[PDB]
Amino acid sequence: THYDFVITETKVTRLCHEKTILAVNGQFPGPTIYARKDDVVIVNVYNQGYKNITLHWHGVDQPRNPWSDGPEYITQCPIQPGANFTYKIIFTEEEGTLWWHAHSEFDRATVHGAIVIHPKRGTVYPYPKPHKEMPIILGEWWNADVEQILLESQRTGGDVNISDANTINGQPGDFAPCSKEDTFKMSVEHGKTYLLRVINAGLTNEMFFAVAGHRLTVVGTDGRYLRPFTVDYILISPGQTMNMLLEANCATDGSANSRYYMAARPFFTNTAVNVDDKNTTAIVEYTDAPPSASAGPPDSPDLPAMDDIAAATAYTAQLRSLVTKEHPIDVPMEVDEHMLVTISVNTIPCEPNKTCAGPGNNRLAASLNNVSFMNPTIDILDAYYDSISGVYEPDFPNKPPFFFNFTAPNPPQDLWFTKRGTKVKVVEYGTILEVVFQDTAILGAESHPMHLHGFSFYVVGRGFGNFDKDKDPATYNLVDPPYQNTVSVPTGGWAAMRFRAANPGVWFMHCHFDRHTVWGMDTVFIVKNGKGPDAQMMPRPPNMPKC
Ligand SMILES: *[C@@H]1O[C@H](CO)[C@@H](O[C@@H]2O[C@H](CO)[C@@H](O)[C@H](O)[C@H]2NC(C)=O)[C@H](O)[C@H]1NC(C)=O
Ligand SMILES: *[C@@H]1O[C@H](CO)[C@@H](O[C@@H]2O[C@H](CO)[C@@H](O)[C@H](O)[C@H]2NC(C)=O)[C@H](O)[C@H]1NC(C)=O
Ligand SMILES: COc1cc(/C=C/CO)cc(OC)c1O
Ligand SMILES: *[C@@H]1O[C@H](CO)[C@@H](O)[C@H](O)[C@H]1NC(C)=O
Ligand SMILES: *[C@@H]1O[C@H](CO)[C@@H](O)[C@H](O)[C@H]1NC(C)=O
Ligand SMILES: *[C@@H]1O[C@H](CO)[C@@H](O)[C@H](O)[C@H]1NC(C)=O
Numbered sequence: 001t002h003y004d005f006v007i008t009e010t011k012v013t014r015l016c017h018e019k020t021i022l023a024v025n026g027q028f029p030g031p032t033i034y035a036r037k038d039d040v041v042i043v044n045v046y047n048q049g050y051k052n053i054t055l056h057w058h059g060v061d062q063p064r065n066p067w068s069d070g071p072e073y074i075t076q077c078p079i080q081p082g083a084n085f086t087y088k089i090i091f092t093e094e095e096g097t098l099w100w101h102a103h104s105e106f107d108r109a110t111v112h113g114a115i116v117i118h119p120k121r122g123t124v125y126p127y128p129k130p131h132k133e134m135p136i137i138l139g140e141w142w143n144a145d146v147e148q149i150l151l152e153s154q155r156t157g158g159d160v161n162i163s164d165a166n167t168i169n170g171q172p173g174d175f176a177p178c179s180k181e182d183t184f185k186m187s188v189e190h191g192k193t194y195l196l197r198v199i200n201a202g203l204t205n206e207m208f209f210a211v212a213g214h215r216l217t218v219v220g221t222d223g224r225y226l227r228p229f230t231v232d233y234i235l236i237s238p239g240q241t242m243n244m245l246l247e248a249n250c251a252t253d254g255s256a257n258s259r260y261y262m263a264a265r266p267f268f269t270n271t272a273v274n275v276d277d278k279n280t281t282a283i284v285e286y287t288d289a290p291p292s293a294s295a296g297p298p299d300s301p302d303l304p305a306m307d308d309i310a311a312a313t314a315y316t317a318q319l320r321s322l323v324t325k326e327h328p329i330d331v332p333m334e335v336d337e338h339m340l341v342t343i344s345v346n347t348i349p350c351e352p353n354k355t356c357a358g359p360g361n362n363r364l365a366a367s368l369n370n371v372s373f374m375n376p377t378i379d380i381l382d383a384y385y386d387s388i389s390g391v392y393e394p395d396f397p398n399k400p401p402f403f404f405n406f407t408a409p410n411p412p413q414d415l416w417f418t419k420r421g422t423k424v425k426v427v428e429y430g431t432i433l434e435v436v437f438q439d440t441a442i443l444g445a446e447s448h449p450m451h452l453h454g455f456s457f458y459v460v461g462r463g464f465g466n467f468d469k470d471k472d473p474a475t476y477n478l479v480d481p482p483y484q485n486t487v488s489v490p491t492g493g494w495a496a497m498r499f500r501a502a503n504p505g506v507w508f509m510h511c512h513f514d515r516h517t518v519w520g521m522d523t524v525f526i527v528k529n530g531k532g533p534d535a536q537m538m539p540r541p542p543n544m545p546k547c
C-alpha cells in the first residue's frame, strides 16, 4: 500500500520522433496502482522533472480529503521541480478500474496510469473470476512537446493542434509509421475469459472500441459494477473507465485466424473542425495455435463511423448500475436543490494590439452557465481553509443567466461571447443535488464528458434538445441508473444526475476534454462541514506546496 512515483524526464520515441516527456518512474504509460476495496494507499511523489506538476486519483472520492485530490490551483499549488509531496488515497465505495493522471496543464498527456481495485479479502467479483486481466489505456501522442502544443494555443487563442496518433498502452499500433514493431499485443488461450480494463486517457475525443471476432460483456464502469450487457463495440469518453469480459473461443486448430485486431477510433461530429481520426490498433493473439494461422493480417473489427451519433447513443443507453444484495444502490429520491448548467464553447475578445486565431479572430474560451472559469493563484482549498478574501466568489449560479433555445443550430454571433471568473457553488453537508447538464449549440453542438471530483453520481436521465424541467423527469431511471464519475452529455442534448453532497471539501467539476478545462468549462463545489467528526474536512497536512 505504498508507492514512490518519481516524475522523470524520459526520452521516448513514437512515429520515429524522439522527445523528452514527463513520465512516472520512466514509464509511459505509468505504473498501475493495485489496491483492494477500502484500502488506504500512500504515494510519495518526487518531482524530478522540469516543471510544476500535480497528480490526481481519478474517481476516488477521497472522503474528507481534498488535500490529496490534486487539481492544480483548486486543492493545491503545484509540486515544484525538486520538491515532493505525499498523497493519501482513501478508497471506499470504489471497486473495479479507475486511473491516475497529472492534473496540471496538459501534463497528463504522458503522466497517467491505471488504478485496479480488486474485491477485498473475503469477497469476489459478481461474475466468474477471469483467467487474466489487462489494462487497456487509450491515449494520444503528439510529436511536438505537449507543453508547446498548449503554449501555442494559449498564444494564438486558436484551437489546440490535433494529436499525431491515437494509442493503446502508449503504442499507435500497426497502421502508423515506425510503429508496427511495438504494437501492443496480448496472448489468449482458447476457452478462457479475459477482463479488459479500458481507460480513456486521451485529452480530446470520445472513442469507439472493439475487438475483431469477439463480443464484449460490459460489467463495470468508474469503479461501480454495471448490469451486464454484451455488445460488439463500446463508446468510452476521456475520464471514463469500462470493464468488460472477452471470451477467447475462436478455433485454435488452424481453421480460423489466430490474431485479431483490438481497435479504437474517435466519435466526433463537428465536421468543421479538425480531428485526429486515425485509428489505433493492438493485437489479440491465440498463442496455442499453429503458425499457419497467423499467416495473414489480423482480422479487423467493424467500428461505427466517426460521426455515428446513433451508435454512441445506443451504447450509452445500455448503462445501468448492478443492483443486488451484495451491491446495493442508493438513488436520492427527494432533491433539495436543482441546477441547470449550460455547457458552451465560447470566445472572448482578443487582447489589445494582437490578432487571435479563434472564431471571428477572437480568443477561444469555454463556460458553465456562461462563467468561464479562471484558475486562482492561491488554490481554492487554502483560501477556503484560511478564509482568504479576493480569491473566489461563492455565487456560481444554479441556472444560466439568459435562457434561449440552447440547442438551436448556428446561434447568432453575439451569443459566442462569455466572461471569465472564479466562482464556486457552496452547499451544506448532505444537500441532495440534481444537476442537469445542458449542451448548447454555440460554436457547434458537441458531446462533453463532464466529470465531478469527490463524488460519483447517478445519471437519472438523458435526451436530445433542451431539457424540459416539467416533462423529462417523468421518465428518469430512479431504479438502477448508472453510477458514474464522468458522464457523456449528449451532442446537442442534456444529462441529469443526482448525488448527496456528503463529502466535506473542495471539489472540481469540469469537462474532461483538456482544451475545454483550460478554456474554462469548469467550476468548484465547496461542501461545508456538517455536524459530527465524520462530516468534518480533514485538517491541512503540514507539508502542502506553497502558493
Ligand atoms: C455571456 O456573457 C457575455 C459577457 O458578459 C454576454 O455578452 C455580452 O452581452 C451584452 C448584451 O446582453 C453586451 O452588452 C456585451 O457587450 C456582451 N459582452 C461581450 C460581447 O463580451 C453574453 O450575452 C452571455 N451569453 C449568454 C448568457 O448566453
Ligand atoms: C510554479 O508554481 C509556483 C507556485 O504556484 C509559482 O510560483 C508563484 O508564482 C506567483 C506568480 O503567479 C508568485 O506570486 C508566487 O510568489 C510564486 N510562489 C512561489 C515561488 O513559491 C511558479 O510561478 C510556477 N511556475 C510556472 C512556470 O508557472
Ligand atoms: C464545439 O466547440 C468547439 C469549437 C471550436 C472552433 C474553433 C475555431 O477556431 C473548436 C473546438 O475545439 C475542437 C471546439 O470544441
Ligand atoms: C521532501 O520535501 C520536504 C519538504 O516538504 C523535505 O523536508 C524532504 O527532505 C524532501 N525529501 C524527502 C522526503 O525525501
Ligand atoms: C500546429 O499545427 C500547425 C499546422 O496546422 C503547424 O504550423 C504548427 O507548427 C503546429 N504547432 C506546433 C507547436 O507544433
Ligand atoms: C486503420 O486505418 C488504416 C489506414 O486508414 C486502415 O488501412 C486500417 O484498415 C484501419 N484498421 C481498422 C481496424 O479499421
Ligand SMILES: *[C@@H]1O[C@H](CO)[C@@H](O)[C@H](O)[C@H]1NC(C)=O
Binding pocket: 352, 353
Ligand atoms: C494598438 O491598438 C490601438 C487601438 O486599436 C491603436 O490605436 C494603436 O495604434 C495600436 N498600436 C500600434 C499599432 O503600435
Ligand SMILES: *[C@@H]1O[C@H](CO)[C@@H](O)[C@H](O)[C@H]1NC(C)=O
Binding pocket: 405, 407, 408, 409
Ligand atoms: C428551438 O430550435 C429547434 C432547432 O432549430 C427548433 O426545432 C425548435 O422549434 C425551436 N424551439 C422554439 C421554441 O423556437
Ligand SMILES: [Cu+2]
Binding pocket: 058, 101, 239, 451, 512
Ligand atoms: Cu480524470
Ligand SMILES: [Cu+2]
Binding pocket: 056, 057, 058, 059, 451, 452, 453
Ligand atoms: Cu477526477
Ligand SMILES: [Cu+2]
Binding pocket: 056, 071, 103, 451, 453, 508, 510
Ligand atoms: Cu479533474
Ligand SMILES: [Cu+2]
Binding pocket: 447, 448, 449, 511, 512, 513, 516, 521
Ligand atoms: Cu467539453
